[PDB]
């Protein structure tokens, strides 16, 4: 398939409901060879299974909060893979206050810092840290959300991280485009994942979108998985710096009238 | 491949440099079954060859300026294909004055009318005219340009057609999304085609883009072809109402500084 | 005030609820000198009153559908005013089918043509037709709507006109910016006017916006009037090609969740 | 004038070339009553003059890096002013590496943190910290740049801060819009200020924009000053969550072809 022989490092695979999960399936299904990351020694076992399920024996710890691990990650990886062809950044986090209720009520220098550190900075951070072993046709891909461009209830500080993340996509594309590397983001629709547990009335949004999206249905990690494989592949060799909505077209309407 | 067994009607195939040409290759290459259109009886012979080259024997006249032919087109087609799975609208035109030099100098109620009739109206026109035989996973795809969103020298009235075209994409996605139909547009970078002959200093733009695009190179009909196949395919089953830039990332920078 | 001595031609003044009405008040209130247009001989009397109410004795017929009247308009005007300092385009229209119910159900080559002729073409049409007597600090201003950028129920074909109109703003700004002329558009929120009678469930939208706008209220022609004066004024001497939302911030949220 | 009797706190006034300077002039000129901030005890003297020049005797230290001073600021201010009617955030900063040369070359967890802390977080930070004494017609205004939406050479990490800042504008508008408070940003064109010294080839950009802007000229702090007075005033009572370009229309074109 269109990923035959491509070596892709996937982050953010946590459950079988993870967006990163559907992207692994879609990649494996297209010939890709995969490697994975996890956070903390207490997940080391779960990711090892998941990796086995995709014929991979490569699992690496990486707390994107630690310069040390990010650097360790690519040193380790280097001994197994000669070069890297794809990196998937499926990483987000915000203190629980910062994504609950009133925007200003959850705001503090600390929450802001953390949400931006982990959800925004980490993406170009990993990029700089892969630059060395990246290939010439290589493709980076990150996940984002409509909340970066429009005020969504409860999203709050996540909204700002995501705006910064999407700006980094553009600055990455320019920085790495010289070397033939492409950088893109997918803007996904609401999908019930672990991370999604912290968005109160997530159920309200999900229902709303199913009512008003042009396609009148919710998206799935397979749909998102499928678009990602594309962007990671050479079919998308003319596509860099894009932010691609995959949300049954929801961004495009004004719903509920 | 990801288009196995899909039946796709392609318009705007004129030369072997046409965008519609690269999209046919990409589709055929992915298992698609193709049908084509042409304008005027004096091209009837050329399109028949082209169709042969993609294992097709289906060629149909269609001047999108004529309600008659647009209707004839889908009546004819109906006797061969039971249903339609994909339609590609690769059609643009503007009187030569309207895309030369000063915007206001080429402006006249007549030019405006024509450019909008042919380049914009025709897309949803064809859609209404296919609605009857369209399938449930069907996908519509049109071509557009960055000049719809930013003032490009010489583009002029084409700029306005293209803004209207892109708006129709959204209204189409809503109208047809109920029936499971997806509608999308690709925003292509500068490609030396016959239509591109009418843009003076097209050579200036093309050179500029090659200098300043993040990927530092120009796009090709194969790159555009490849993205189109994707959008026409069920890989993009979560993607509707999108306008997808395929231009080495050019929209995303500010060049020449 | 900030319009002292500026001579401004206003179109689209039909009732005392018209957007063009609130812009006249705001302009007069700021020292402006006004002139007005009307359509058909059977409104000649109403506009004459309205003009009196703003200390003006200048009323001119102009069916923007007729090259003749558009030209007559500025010939006439020229004998009274030596030069023009501001033009307000407050003109929209679409056959009733084209803004009712299903998008595709109201679509016909004829409706499309008409809505685009009157709502879109007319703006740059008038501009070319004023170019001769326009001054160096002159400012053009048109009205638009959020339906140009996102699919709104019932808006339909008006959506496409408005996208083309907004593109013309950019091409105008480039064309006339050389001569010091500025061109801008205001994107207004829902306001109960005569034109708004043709949007079924306009009452539904208006209520929705009042519920979900960040400011939690609907806009008024005075609010729109006030922004327009600004754009027409030399306060906005650094502002061209802008599309300025004036809608209690509605474009910026995702409502109803 | 349109700011008669309004009490506005201005930050970021550093030189007579400051953007905040032109906004003070424009505000004073329209009837406003002003108060100012400064950073560090070694500027205490300069701001005191500047404040005298606008008939103000209110100057307050505020390192937006310190929770302490931000809180002190509004406690102090409270004893002089009963309530606040306008706040201007004219604050930006990034380590010199982060805005020099290659994006990835200037990237470090620390630079990112700092640029986001000072340029992005500080705006809603100040807002929460003013909420108590803010009035019902109150208006917040921040400064931003086109680099938030498109990759500009050298801007780099500033690009991301600015994207986050502009997202905060939307989330602010929603949070404070309930209480009648409006929140807006101005996207300014290149202006030779102290902060602008750190952008290498700033002179290249400034020249480029003067060549290609629709108005064919650069903007000035008076032009920006004038737009800001507007947004701070009740003329803009229908305008919240907007990001208003003031850049001779530069965002709207594609230059250099
Ligand atoms: N759920 C949705 O609807 C949705 C929509 C759009 C985007 N997203 C985005 O997609 C991404 C994935 O979220 P998800 O929905 O698949 O939920 P998920 O929980 O399955 O994925 C989140 C991942 O973030 C990882 N992560 C958190 N902190 C980390 C750290 N300090 N270092 C490294 N990794 C860390 C978690 O381990 C987890 O694997 C996120 O970036 C999120 O913003 C989710
Ligand atoms: N080269 C560029 O960078 C570029 C970018 C974006 C979109 N396009 C678009 O793609 C399409 C074609 O591009 P192209 O470069 O191959 O131009 P092309 O001239 O080489 O081919 C386009 C085809 O549209 C045809 N056409 C004209 N009138 C028609 C009608 N009434 N009915 C059906 N077809 C008609 C033309 O004759 C031509 O065959 C157009 O829609 C154009 O707007 C070109
Ligand atoms: N209410 C809304 O929310 C809203 C929002 C944005 C823009 N508008 C726009 O502002 C303008 C008018 O709004 P309105 O609410 O006052 O509608 P209105 O009907 O109350 O007044 C608009 C005027 O345009 C006039 N017009 C029609 N054909 C004309 C022609 N050939 N030449 C000159 N004028 C003509 C109408 O007759 C009417 O007098 C239109 O451009 C419309 O698109 C309305
Ligand atoms: N120069 C331009 O072309 C331009 C264009 C668009 C936006 N801007 C933006 O406008 C704002 C003002 O910049 P400027 O161009 O007027 O230059 P400026 O130097 O005159 O203003 C910058 C201000 O930021 C202040 N500041 C820096 N660190 C601070 C801190 N730790 N705490 C509080 N205040 C601090 C400085 O004291 C200074 O007063 C910035 O936010 C900038 O991003 C500048
Ligand atoms: C609103 C649903 C969309 C969405 C859901 C979950 C998301 O994942 C999060 C959310 C907050 C913090 C960390 C990760 C997300 O980015 C986007
Ligand atoms: C730089 C030229 C970009 C471009 C070239 C050809 C294009 O196709 C045309 C051109 C003119 C009229 C109608 C359709 C186009 O849309 C855009
Ligand atoms: C919710 C309605 C918004 C709206 C109302 C009236 C408007 O003015 C019209 C309406 C229909 C046709 C032509 C011009 C408008 O543009 C937008
Ligand atoms: C490129 C010119 C536009 C611009 C110039 C100076 C600016 O001010 C800065 C820049 C970097 C760090 C801190 C403040 C700015 O935001 C935007």
Report residue C216 as tokens.
């939690």
Residue ranges of the alpha helices (H) in chain C?
Answer: 19-28, 44-53, 67-80, 109-116, 122-130, 157-177, 202-212, 221-232
Q: Which long-range contacts (CB under 8 A, 24 or more apart) does B95-100 make?
A: B96/B198, B98/B156, B98/B157, B98/B158, B99/B154, B99/B155, B99/B156, B99/B157, B99/B158, B99/B198, B99/B199, B100/B154, B100/B156, B100/B198, B100/B200
Name chain C's partners: 3 or more CB pairs within 8 A: A, B, D
Are the C-beta atoms of residues B123 and B142 closer than 8 Å to each other? Answer: yes
Are the C-beta atoms of residues D209 and D190 closer than 8 Å to each other? Answer: yes
Chain D contact present for A94, CB below 8 A? no
Q: How many CB pairs under 8 A join A and B?
A: 124
By what technique were these coordinates determined?
X-ray
Residue B57 exposed, middle or buried by CB count within 10 Å (0-12, 13-18, 19+): exposed
Q: What is the edge-to-edge ordering of all strands in the sheet holding D243-246? A: D59-61, D33-38, D7-10, D84-89, D134-145, D182-188, D243-246
Residue that is written with structure tokens 């979560």 in the block: B238
Q: Are strands C182-188 and C243-246 parallel, antiparallel or unpaired?
A: parallel
Report residue D177 as tokens.
């819009």
Taken in order B192, B140, B119, B75, the sign of the CA dihedral is positive
- Could you give the CA distance from residue D116 to residue D161 in angstroms, rounded to a whole number? 5
Q: Does the distance separating the beta carbons of A254 and C146 come in below 8 Å?
A: yes
- Could you give the CA distance from residue D44 to residue C219 in angstroms, rounded to a whole number? 43
Chain B contact present for D201, CB below 8 A? yes
Report how far ligand 1's centroid is from the alpha carbon of A68 (Å).
21
Binding site per annotation, positions of C for substrate: 94
- Could you give the CA distance from residue D23 to residue D13 in angstroms, rounded to a whole number? 9
Supply φ then ψ for residue C87, to 5 degrees: -125, 130
Are the C-beta atoms of residues C64 and C73 closer than 8 Å to each other? Answer: no
Which of D103, D152, D249, D257 is the best residue to mutate to test the B interface, defined by the most B CB atoms within 10 Å of its own CB?
Answer: D257
Q: Is D193 annotated as a binding residue?
A: yes
Q: Does the distance separating the beta carbons of B208 and D257 come in below 8 Å?
A: yes
Task: Give the ligand at the shortest distance from the Cα of B18.
Answer: 2
Q: Is D195 annotated as a binding residue?
A: yes
Give D213→chain B minimum CA distance, Å: 11
Chain C contact present for B164, CB below 8 A? yes
Query: Is B143 near ligand 2, meaning CB less than 6 Å away?
Result: yes
Smallest Cα–Cα separation from B145: which of B196, B211, B198?
A: B196
| Nearest CB to C215 within list D240, D244, D245 | D240
Residue ranges of the alpha helices (H) in chain D?
Answer: 19-28, 44-53, 67-80, 109-116, 122-130, 157-177, 202-212, 221-232
- Could you give the CA distance from residue B56 to residue B78 in angstroms, rounded to a whole number? 15
Report residue B48 as tokens.
């028949």
Supply φ then ψ for residue D103, to 5 degrees: -50, -55
- Could you give the CA distance from residue B34 to residue B38 in angstroms, rounded to a whole number? 14
Chain C contact present for B174, CB below 8 A? yes
Query: Is B19 near ligand 2, meaning CB less than 6 Å away?
Result: yes
Chain C contact present for D10, CB below 8 A? no
Which residues in B lie closer than 8 A to residue C178 (C-beta atoms)?
none
Q: Does the distance separating the beta carbons of C251 and D238 come in below 8 Å?
A: no
Ligand 4: atom nearest CA of D89 is 41
Torsion of CA C54, C55, C59, C65, to 10 degrees: -30
Angle between helices A157-177 and D157-177 (to 10 degrees): 160
Element of type H or E holding C65: none
Name chain D's partners: 3 or more CB pairs within 8 A: A, B, C
Residue D52 exposed, middle or buried by CB count within 10 Å (0-12, 13-18, 19+): exposed
CATH numeric code, B1-257: 3.40.50.720
Element of type H or E holding A135: strand A134-145
CA distances from B25 to A213, B31, B194 (A): 32, 10, 18
Q: Does the distance separating the beta carbons of C103 and B171 come in below 8 Å?
A: yes
- Could you give the CA distance from residue D7 to residue D139 in angstroms, rounded to a whole number? 11
CA distances from D244 to C89, C190, D13, D189, D253 (A): 21, 21, 21, 11, 16
Q: Does the distance separating the beta carbons of A109 and D113 come in below 8 Å?
A: no
Report how far ligand 4's centroid is from the alpha carbon of A153 (Å).
31
Residue D145 exposed, middle or buried by CB count within 10 Å (0-12, 13-18, 19+): buried
Q: Does the distance separating the beta carbons of C214 and A254 come in below 8 Å?
A: no
Given in angstroms, what resolution was this structure solved at?
Answer: 2.6
Query: Is B159 near ligand 2, meaning CB less than 6 Å away?
Result: no
Which residues on adjacent β-strands are paired with residue C246? Answer: C188
Q: What is the edge-to-edge ordering of all strands in the sheet holding C243-246? A: C59-61, C33-38, C7-10, C84-89, C134-145, C182-188, C243-246
Under 8 Å CB-to-CB from C143, ≥6 apart: which residues?
A: C12, C19, C89, C90, C92, C185, C186, C188
Which residues in B lie closer than 8 A to residue A146 (C-beta atoms)?
none
Chain B contact present for C156, CB below 8 A? yes
- Could you give the CA distance from residue A227 to residue A23 in angstroms, rounded to a whole number? 8
Q: Does the distance separating the beta carbons of A201 and C254 come in below 8 Å?
A: no
Residue B42 exposed, middle or buried by CB count within 10 Å (0-12, 13-18, 19+): exposed
Q: Which of C196, C201, C218 to mutate to test the pocket of ligand 7 (most atoms within 8 A of CB)?
A: C196
Task: Spell out where chain B has E strands.
Answer: 7-10, 33-38, 59-61, 84-89, 134-145, 182-188, 243-246
Task: Report domain extents, chain B.
Answer: 1-257
- Could you give the CA distance from residue A68 to residue A70 in angstroms, rounded to a whole number? 6
Supply φ then ψ for residue A235, to 5 degrees: -55, -40
Which of B128, B130, B167 is the best residue to mutate to test the C interface, defined by the most C CB atoms within 10 Å of its own CB?
Answer: B167
Which residues on adjacent β-strands are paired with residue D8? Answer: D34, D86
Element of type H or E holding D134: strand D134-145
The residues of A annotated as belonging to the active site are: 145, 155
The full length of chain A comes to: 257
- Could you give the CA distance from residue D24 to residue D47 in angstroms, rounded to a whole number? 12
Nearest CA to ligand 1 atom 1: A191
Tell me the HSE value of D203 on the side-chain side, using a 13 A CA sphere.
1
Residue that is written with structure tokens 């290459």 in the block: B29
Under 8 Å CB-to-CB from A110, ≥6 apart: which residues?
A: A95
- Could you give the CA distance from residue D254 to residue D257 in angstroms, rounded to a whole number? 8
CA angle B85, B63, C165 (to 5 degrees): 85
Residue ranges of the alpha helices (H) in chain A?
Answer: 19-28, 44-53, 67-80, 109-116, 122-130, 157-177, 202-212, 221-232
Are the C-beta atoms of residues C139 and C232 closer than 8 Å to each other? Answer: yes
Chain B contact present for A241, CB below 8 A? yes
Report residue B64 as tokens.
């999108």
Residue C45 exposed, middle or buried by CB count within 10 Å (0-12, 13-18, 19+): exposed
Q: What is the edge-to-edge ordering of all strands in the sheet holding B243-246? A: B59-61, B33-38, B7-10, B84-89, B134-145, B182-188, B243-246
Are the C-beta atoms of residues B23 and B90 closer than 8 Å to each other? Answer: yes
Angle between helices B67-80 and B122-130 (to 10 degrees): 40
Task: Give the ligand at the shortest distance from the Cα of D24.
Answer: 4
């Amino acid at each position: 398939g269109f990923l035959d022989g491509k070596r892709i490092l996937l982050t953010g695979l946590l459950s079988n409901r993870s967006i990163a999960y559907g992207i692994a399936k879609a990649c494996k299904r297209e010939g890709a060879e995969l490697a994975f990351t996890y956070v903390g020694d207490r997940f080391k076992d779960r990711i090892t299974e998941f990796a086995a399920e995709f014929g991979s024996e490569l699992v690496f710890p990486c707390d994107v909060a630690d310069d040390a691990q990010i650097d360790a990650l690519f040193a380790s990886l280097k001994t197994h893979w000669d070069s890297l062809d794809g990196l998937v950044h499926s990483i987000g986090f915000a203190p629980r206050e910062a994504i609950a209720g009133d925007f200003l009520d959850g705001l503090t220098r600390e929450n802001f810092r953390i949400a931006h550190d982990i959800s925004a900075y980490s993406f170009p951070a990993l990029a700089k840290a892969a630059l060395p072993m990246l290939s010439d046709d290589a493709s980076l891909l990150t996940l984002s959300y409509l909340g970066a461009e429009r005020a969504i209830p409860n999203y709050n500080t996540m909204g700002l991280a995501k705006a910064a993340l999407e700006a980094s996509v553009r600055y990455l594309a320019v920085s790495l485009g010289a070397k033939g590397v492409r950088v893109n983001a997918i803007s996904a629709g609401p999908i019930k994942t672990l991370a999604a547990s912290g968005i109160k009335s997530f159920g309200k949004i999900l229902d709303f979108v199913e009512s008003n999206s042009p396609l009148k249905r919710n998206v799935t990690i397979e749909q998102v998985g499928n678009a990602g494989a594309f962007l990671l592949s050479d079919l998308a060799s003319g596509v860099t710096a894009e932010v691609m909505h995959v949300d049954s077209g929801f961004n495009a309407v004004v719903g509920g009238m």
